[PDB]
Amino acid sequence: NYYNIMRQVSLDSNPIVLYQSSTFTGNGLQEFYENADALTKYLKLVPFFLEKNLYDHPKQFVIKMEFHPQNKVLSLDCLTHQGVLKKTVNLENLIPVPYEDYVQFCRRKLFNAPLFLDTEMIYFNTFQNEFYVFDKNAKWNEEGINHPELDISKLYNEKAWFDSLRII
Amino acid sequence: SSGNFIVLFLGWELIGLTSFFLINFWSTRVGTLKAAFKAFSFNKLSDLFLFFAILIIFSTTYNLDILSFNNQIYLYESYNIDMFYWSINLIEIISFFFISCAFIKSAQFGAHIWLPDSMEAPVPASALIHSATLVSAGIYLLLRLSPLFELSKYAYFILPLIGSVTAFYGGLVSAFQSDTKKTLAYSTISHCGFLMVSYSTGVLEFVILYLYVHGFFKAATFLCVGNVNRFNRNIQDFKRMGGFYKYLPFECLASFVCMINLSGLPLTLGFYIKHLLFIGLVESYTLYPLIFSSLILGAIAGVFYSYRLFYSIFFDTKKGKKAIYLQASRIILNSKFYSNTSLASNLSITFLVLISYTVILYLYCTTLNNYYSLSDLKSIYINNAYSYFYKPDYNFLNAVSILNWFVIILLISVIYLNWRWSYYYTKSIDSLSKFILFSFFFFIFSKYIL
Amino acid sequence: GDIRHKFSNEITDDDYDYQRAMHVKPPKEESLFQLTNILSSVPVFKTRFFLDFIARNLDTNSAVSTSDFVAPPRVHENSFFVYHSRELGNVIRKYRSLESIVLPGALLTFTYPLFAAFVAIPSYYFMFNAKIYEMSRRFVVRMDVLPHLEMISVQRIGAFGILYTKLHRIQDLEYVPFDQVKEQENYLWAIGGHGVDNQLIFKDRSTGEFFYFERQGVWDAKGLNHPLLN
Amino acid sequence: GWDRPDVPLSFNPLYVHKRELSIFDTNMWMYDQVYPEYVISYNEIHLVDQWKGLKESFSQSAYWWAMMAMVFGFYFINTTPRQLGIDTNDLKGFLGEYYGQYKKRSGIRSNFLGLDVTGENSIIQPNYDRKNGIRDVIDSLNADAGKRKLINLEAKNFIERVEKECEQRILKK
Amino acid sequence: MLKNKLIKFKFFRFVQSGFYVDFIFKKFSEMFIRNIFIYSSIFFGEKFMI
Amino acid sequence: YAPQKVVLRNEKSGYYANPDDVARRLIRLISLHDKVQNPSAITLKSTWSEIGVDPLSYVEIMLEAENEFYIELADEDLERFRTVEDAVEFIARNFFTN
Amino acid sequence: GHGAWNENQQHYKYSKEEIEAYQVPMRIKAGPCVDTYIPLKKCFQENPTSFAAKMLDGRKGKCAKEFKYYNTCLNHWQTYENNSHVTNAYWADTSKANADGISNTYGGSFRKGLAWLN
Amino acid sequence: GGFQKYPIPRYLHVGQWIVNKNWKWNTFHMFFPTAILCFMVWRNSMISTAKPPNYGEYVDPQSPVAPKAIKY
């Protein structure tokens, strides 16, 4: 029996950028519209947003991810059919999932996904029962991801990672 | 295809003996011999009844020809036979012996005890015996000697009651069954009960249609479950079967089609047989309440067993031994020839389904069409049941809706009902709410707003 | 381990591509008739009219949760929240709301409302009442604590989706082990008790009313650690 | 992959007798040299004996009796009997022949050779003064057919009366 | 209806076993076989009467 | 085709399954258990008590071994087993279909 | 023309020998539509067609002229057999039917189901 | 799928896994003679076969073929 107890975390002063999508690098849906690559990727994601809405598939396309080691919280900028939204996640609630697990979570046959949706790097927030999907055409901060607080030696839990999400 | 009672009795004994051999195919085991001996004892009892009935017929009329007996029995209908201390009606006693042997060979209630044990035979033998070969001998007897039973008080009282009781019993036991062959056997018992009730209604065309539909689709389902059992290494219980849809793709879809047709479900070839049975059901019986309630329960029972069999075999969580899946999931096996079944088996099942569809359609056109083009049945008893098939009234049209909606609710239960915790519990309830509301709005638009 | 390459006439992934409809594999290429390809190719969807329609006429980002910590509005100026239900509460609300549309609509639309009621009655009593309705009646949408009263306010979904709050004294709350109720309500827990926690059932001794808490419900650490509840 | 040894002789295990074969159990055991078995298998052994089996069967079948009662009640308070019986156009036939046989009484006619023997002088004899058996069913079918014919005639009379009343109302204006 | 006894495994196995009809019939058949084919026919019949 | 000459049963090696694979799979299954601490210390000659398998943990491990190997082991045989050597020998020599 | 529903186009009544020749199933011979049935059977024999065509053709194609008479006779036969023309009237308005009894024999026992209280 | 093959004694005339090299000629010489025998049986039996009249035929009651009652 796992209970969703909230700890009332807050952001720190200087975050460390870990993820930065090469596309959508600009700020604002207006900038995405005016940029050629951003507009086409947004159109390709329109079915992704449609799946979010009508198929009740909890997922988010994540860009510009930052990390706060002082409080151990990830700040994610997510792109939705309406614009860019800011979300906060606790490392204790974040676990990795296979792409097939992400697909099988939804009971509706998802539309044929685009080729820029990174299938390997799909993560799952257990507190929100949600999926985070990153972009293949992106840049990862090696020094940021090699932070001690992000190490599996500290963030690893067999029961949570392997037995928490049993889709069947 | 027997021309006289002697040839009929010969064929009766021959089917009994050959069914015994098929059941006892595994001669090395004595456990199989017990089931074979059970079937043998019941068959010998049926042979006794049939022989005694034939002797009575020969003593009355100095003739064994089937046509002559059928065209003469009405003259002797008024006769009685002086037995030990009672004067029994001749027609009643002859029909009593015939119906007893027919019940024994059709596995009606009480005499059905051998059929579940006869599943020890290999699946092809089981399919052949349980589809249209061994369990339809009583139906053939009734159809061939119908002029006798039309003047039988005992037949009138016994055929509907026993048929409905057997239908209910077989349907419910099949629904609660966990083994594939046992489920099919109890479904066969239920359908034989329905055949008895159809003959009681007295529309030989409906009886023939029911027989054809049941035989074809029962055989096809038996073949599919045989492939499933062979893949599962002779374990016939689906408690050890799960996630077989990918390992047996053809079996999954073939079983889906065959089961939806077998279990009378809306918008399928097998719905009309039950519809016609309920159209023809008679209402002058003294035990009509029990008969009708048992018939309704047996008819609805089809959904549960079909759903359980299909879902548990194919799309349930993997419950079988790790070896069953691993031995077949090896990458080395990936090839254009890869399959867990036989290509000849798949082709045989496909052709059987196609031919069954075509033949059932031909029979439906012959009988249920506006222009009646069936050949003469050589019977002078007209039941009036076709009146409610040609010009049904509002009362009957709305009465059928009760059973239709009962089946609908049962389908909704077997689909949306949760028995185990899942990640999709809340979303399943939400989907049910969406379906209900959308159904209401769709009906509103279809009927009124267009 | 794979030896398909050793033969020229052996099956290929190009031959297996047709199974992607029935088999889940990561995308390889985009067909000309995919939704993504159509939207990215047809210049009509690039029009600012269509873009603005997408931006406005759909689910808003405002309602999207933005953190793992939630502080719902206080029920009372002096109370503090402890427990709240996220998804099962909304599902139950939407299900019970059907009684405000389907039921009057059924009465005014069905040719035989009595037939509909006669079908619904046994349906309710078997496989529906225990399935959803009793669980919803005992379901706790929200729980707050009023310290001045030393009471707990519990919000519940009523008929037609109406929400009502009731007060229960902390001194009248007890823990009911699941063993004492499993046999009494096996059917309820069999078909409808999966959403709520089996081992975290409480009841009010005075009123004899149960409290079911959603498994996927948010609890407040401060609320749990408050001395009143400990 | 592995080269398996030839199938074991152990697959069929020789059965060694350790108990006397009582003559009071003759043919009550399916004798075998590997896997002897009792002639009858009792899978439902959790029931100690048949009597407790009957008790359990009836106690559990009470539920099915209740289901049948509820289903019949639902159909009874929501349906009406249908019009069923022999076709009114075929009274001369199955129904006609049934009574024709008893009217003819041809089974008790004098012998053609002039022998003193006749009907009623055999174990199987004719009884044309009998009113049991299928007689009740035939009478019920005949009564139902007559009732349906009467209903049709009454409907015809009603339509004629309505036509006459309408004609008279038109004339009286 | 919050308490349903039909979902319990006792009723489930009762129905799955075909209402125990086969068990009851087999027990009665055993009684008939033992009494008629051995005690009454062989011993009382062959040993005593004959 | 079998030759027309008389051919006798060929008991190649008492093992009906690769004993090395059987032993490795059994050792992996044992290591999966929580009570087992050091998988390295486990050898075919190591007793259950010394490798750390309690009498009650033994029945759990043996049930999972039955599931893994697609066979049923009698209580008599399980109690007769005294070392991983005996366990793997019995499993390998067992004809999976009895 | 202007013939009753049982008479055929030619107003010809077939004899027993003719029925035996164009052998009619007992199911049809029992009813009153033998005269209208025989021409339809003769037309089908003259122009045999597949069962699929019979099912999919709503006017019986070539044999439509005879099928019209046969269908009218069949409708009347079945309606009079099941008394549906009176049962439907009672279902539509039981109160008015009792007021001007269409058939007291059926009216005295008719009782519409409580569920169908339109 | 099937059971593992095991040796069968040579002296014993049993059907366990019996395959014949000359099965083609054996089938050829077992099918056609059987067909001829059945053809002879069929043509012998056709002499005593009965069929009802055709579509356009009626049985004259006074013709010899029509059934005749016994004349005492």
Ligand SMILES: CCCCCCCCCCCCCCCCCC(=O)OC[C@H](COP(=O)([O-])OCC(O)COP(=O)([O-])OC[C@@H](COC(=O)CCCCCCCCCCCCCCCCC)OC(=O)CCCCCCCCCCCCCCCCC)OC(=O)CCCCCCCCCCCCCCCCC
């Ligand atoms: C001037 C231009 C005008 C354009 C007008 C356009 C109008 C569009 C109206 C659309 C109406 C809604 C359609 C919904 C379809 C999906 C339904 C569904 O799945 O729900 C059940 C769904 C569960 O089902 P599921 O399987 O789990 O769903 C998985 C996915 O949906 C994945 O689903 P799936 O892929 O498994 O199957 C879904 C499929 C369902 O499709 C069907 O079932 C239709 C099958 C075809 C019917 C054809 C009929 C007419 C032709 C008859 C034959 C003529 C023969 C002529 C002679 C031929 C001679 C050879 O969807 C379609 O209908 C596809 C369109 C049909 C394309 C092909 C048609 C034939 C073309 C000609 C032949 C060539 C074919 C290709 C080549 C073949 C090989 C050679 O339940 C839900 O939960 C539904 C939730 C709501 C979802 C809504 C998503 C869409 C939202 C759209 C919002 C509005 C957007 C407006 C944009 C406007 C821009 C301007």
Ligand SMILES: CCCCCCCCCCCCCCCCCC(=O)OC[C@H](COP(=O)([O-])OCC(O)COP(=O)([O-])OC[C@@H](COC(=O)CCCCCCCCCCCCCCCCC)OC(=O)CCCCCCCCCCCCCCCCC)OC(=O)CCCCCCCCCCCCCCCCC
């Ligand atoms: C002209 C008028 C003529 C009128 C004629 C009236 C004739 C009446 C004959 C009555 C015969 C009673 C025979 C009793 C035998 C008891 C044997 C015994 O000691 O067993 C021990 C055994 C318990 O020992 P155990 O070791 O604990 O058992 C282990 C089990 O595993 C443990 O099993 P479990 O715990 O797992 O589950 C077992 C469960 C099994 O589930 C059930 O029992 C529930 C469903 C029961 C359905 C009963 C049949 C439904 C009606 C069918 C009617 C068919 C004929 C009429 C058709 C008309 C069509 C138009 O039963 C229960 O535990 C619940 C107990 C309460 C059951 C209900 C008792 C009702 C008694 C009668 C009350 C009558 C009040 C009349 C007031 C009138 C005011 C004006 O008993 C049981 O297991 C329960 C047996 C229950 C039998 C109830 C039979 C009721 C029959 C009512 C007929 C009413 C006809 C009305 C006609 C009106 C016409 C106008």
Ligand SMILES: CCCCCCCCCCCCCCCCCC(=O)OC[C@H](COP(=O)([O-])OCC(O)COP(=O)([O-])OC[C@@H](COC(=O)CCCCCCCCCCCCCCCCC)OC(=O)CCCCCCCCCCCCCCCCC)OC(=O)CCCCCCCCCCCCCCCCC
């Ligand atoms: C692997 C899957 C396995 C299968 C899963 C299946 C899932 C579904 C399961 C349920 C499906 C049905 C199963 C069969 C019934 C089982 C019953 C049972 O086990 O209960 C045992 C239970 C006792 O054991 P327990 O330990 O308390 O059981 C726990 C409770 O179940 C716990 O209950 P609770 O505290 O939670 O509250 C619920 C309560 C309340 O629940 C309900 O009431 C459920 C809703 C019932 C609706 C019935 C509709 C019937 C259809 C027609 C009417 C439609 C409406 C039309 C409009 C209104 C009327 C115009 O439940 C009950 O009281 C028992 C349910 C009602 C059983 C009635 C059985 C038939 C009675 C006789 C026939 C009546 C029909 C007409 C007959 C006409 C002549 C042939 O209750 C019973 O005793 C059963 C009834 C015994 C009847 C005895 C004979 C009659 C008594 C004398 C009547 C005298 C009348 C005099 C009139 C005079 C006029 C002048």
Ligand SMILES: CCCCCCCCCCCCCCCCCC(=O)OC[C@H](COP(=O)([O-])OCC[N+](C)(C)C)OC(=O)CCCCCCCCCCCCCCCCC
């Ligand atoms: C023998 C006796 C037999 C008796 C049988 C009785 C059968 C009839 C039963 C009548 C039930 C009446 C239900 C009332 C529902 C409202 C109850 C309530 O207070 O809920 C407030 C609830 C909740 O109120 P609230 O105050 O909590 O919040 C307001 C709403 N939300 C939650 C969204 C903020 O509000 C509603 O649900 C409003 C519903 C309004 C519409 C109601 C009628 C819809 C159907 C119209 C007819 C059918 C469609 C026609 C289409 C025509 C198209 C051309």
Ligand SMILES: CCCCCCCCCCCCCCCCCC(=O)OC[C@H](COP(=O)([O-])OCC[N+](C)(C)C)OC(=O)CCCCCCCCCCCCCCCCC
């Ligand atoms: C009068 C008192 C209040 C009665 C409230 C109404 C009953 C309870 C709420 C029922 C909501 C579900 C309505 C579904 C309507 C589907 C279309 C339809 O047939 O409507 C007209 C028909 C009735 O309209 P009608 O009376 O004009 O139809 C002609 C009459 N018959 C059909 C009998 C020939 O709807 C029904 O029959 C509904 C029966 C009651 C259902 C009770 C709940 C069980 C079903 C669970 C919900 C999901 C069902 C999904 C069904 C999908 C299709 C099989």
Ligand SMILES: CCCCCCCCCCCCCCCCCC(=O)OC[C@H](COP(=O)([O-])OCC[N+](C)(C)C)OC(=O)CCCCCCCCCCCCCCCCC
């Ligand atoms: C009271 C009104 C008058 C009607 C009287 C009769 C009331 C309804 C009686 C229904 C009995 C159905 C028995 C089915 C047994 C299936 C057993 C089985 O296969 O295992 C369970 C299978 C599931 O098998 P499974 O393999 O998926 O899982 C089994 C899980 N365990 C073993 C734990 C239980 O199916 C079901 O669970 C569904 C049956 C239970 C729900 C029954 C709902 C009944 C709704 C009645 C609607 C009435 C509509 C109104 C009109 C009615 C009259 C015309």
Ligand SMILES: CCCCCCCCCCCCCCCCCC(=O)OC[C@H](COP(=O)([O-])OCC[N+](C)(C)C)OC(=O)CCCCCCCCCCCCCCCCC
């Ligand atoms: C007043 C009460 C009177 C009661 C009279 C009851 C008489 C009939 C009793 C039944 C048995 C009759 C003897 C035949 C025994 C056959 C045993 C057998 O073959 O074992 C196989 C089986 C045992 O096999 P099994 O079913 O246990 O297990 C095999 C199946 N597997 C492999 C799956 C385990 O026997 C039976 O099950 C019982 C068979 C009953 C049917 C017998 C048919 C013949 C009936 C003859 C009636 C003669 C009446 C004479 C006059 C009486 C006057 C009172």
Ligand SMILES: CCCCCCCCCCCCCCCCCC(=O)OC[C@H](COP(=O)([O-])OCC[N+](C)(C)C)OC(=O)CCCCCCCCCCCCCCCCC
């Ligand atoms: C190597 C050869 C292997 C064997 C190949 C055999 C291929 C058979 C293909 C068709 C089989 C399935 C037919 C459809 C299902 C039955 C339909 C039905 O009920 O009949 C309705 C219809 C009946 O006609 P109707 O239904 O259209 O209506 C007739 C209309 N009236 C009455 C007015 C005249 O029958 C068919 O369509 C079936 C085909 C006709 C019958 C053919 C029989 C002769 C076969 C000749 C070939 C012989 C090959 C020998 C090979 C020997 C090898 C050793």
Ligand SMILES: CCCCCCCCCCCCCCCCCC(=O)OC[C@H](COP(=O)([O-])OCC[N+](C)(C)C)OC(=O)CCCCCCCCCCCCCCCCC
């Ligand atoms: C003039 C017209 C035609 C004349 C032909 C007359 C034919 C007369 C009957 C001949 C029967 C031949 C039986 C041969 C059995 C050979 C052994 C065997 O099969 O394996 C035994 C098997 C295994 O045998 P095995 O493999 O150990 O040994 C085979 C080789 N031998 C025997 C030489 C060592 O053992 C059994 O389990 C016994 C099975 C017996 C099955 C008997 C079935 C017969 C079915 C016939 C149906 C006919 C229908 C008739 C319809 C019309 C009726 C009017």
